[PDB]
Symmetry: C2
Subunit: 133 residues, 2 copies
């Protein structure tokens, strides 16, 4: 399942923008890009309240076997019940992430991916649109 | 290479908005919705100039690898070089297509499908925007 959009070649130099609305109540929501649900180059988890993580972004990658080493950021422009928008692009070394308030993040391209074929949102939000150009 | 958007389940009751840019000097561009590249419930070919078709939308479906019987529309709010946007819904009997105009088309849901999992664009355009609500 999940819509296969043929034209969307999310490769080095392309910019992926996702937009949506965070649930009225929210602990966290994530943007995930990689090969599949369990094989991710970038997991971008925006945690309003998840364990010791309050208004913290957690970044990580995943392999079938499990999660890798987390990175954290306190840049947190999001609020429950509000519009979110995120743009992601990458080269062979890094992912470059821009949040709607102009905050910017970076994350290693650990598996040296040149193209990504899978996107999801998970957690307490809904995905409205996917833009690629 | 394509992007699977996990969250997007294009089933009866949902509204698929597809957007992009038409190439300068365009001759035709098409939007396709189905199960796979050669199995389509809806093919919308927006023909600026293709054979005897001038500023005409050609609507069809594809079963096995074969085109079925074409329907045509002369409502053509499209310009080379410009952004386009089209919204598609369906129930088990019809597909409903709304143009940026407000102009609407209807096409039979020939194979009475309840969900579609493949979207593509071909010809003198690029697909940049996919929204689903
Ligand atoms: O690494 C992303 C991954 O984190 C999991 O939660 C971690 C948490 O980040 C960490 O602080 C704690 O020590 O271990 C938890 C369990 O592994 C999430 O459960 C998972 O959904 C991802 O978000
Ligand atoms: O039916 C969609 C399909 O049409 C093809 O062109 C047709 C044309 O529309 C028809 O009037 C003529 O009789 O036969 C042509 C060949 O089947 C396009 O070539 C194809 O790309 C689709 O758009």
């Amino acid at each position: 399942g999940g819509l296969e959009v043929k034209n969307f070649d999310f490769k080095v130099g392309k910019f992926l923008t996702v937009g949506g609305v965070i649930n009225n109540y929210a602990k966290r929501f994530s943007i995930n890009v990689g090969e599949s649900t369990n094989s991710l180059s970038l997991h971008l988890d925006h945690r309003f309240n998840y364990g010791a993580d309050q208004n913290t972004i957690v970044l990580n990658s995943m392999v079938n076997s499990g999660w890798e080493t987390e990175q954290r950021s306190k840049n947190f422009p999001f609020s429950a019940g509000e519009y979110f928008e995120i743009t992601i692009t990458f080269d062979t070394n890094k992912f470059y992430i821009e949040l709607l308030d102009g905050h910017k993040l970076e994350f290693p391209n650990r598996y040296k991916k040149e193209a990504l074929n899978f996107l999801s949102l998970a957690g307490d939000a809904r995905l409205t649109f996917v833009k690629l150009e």
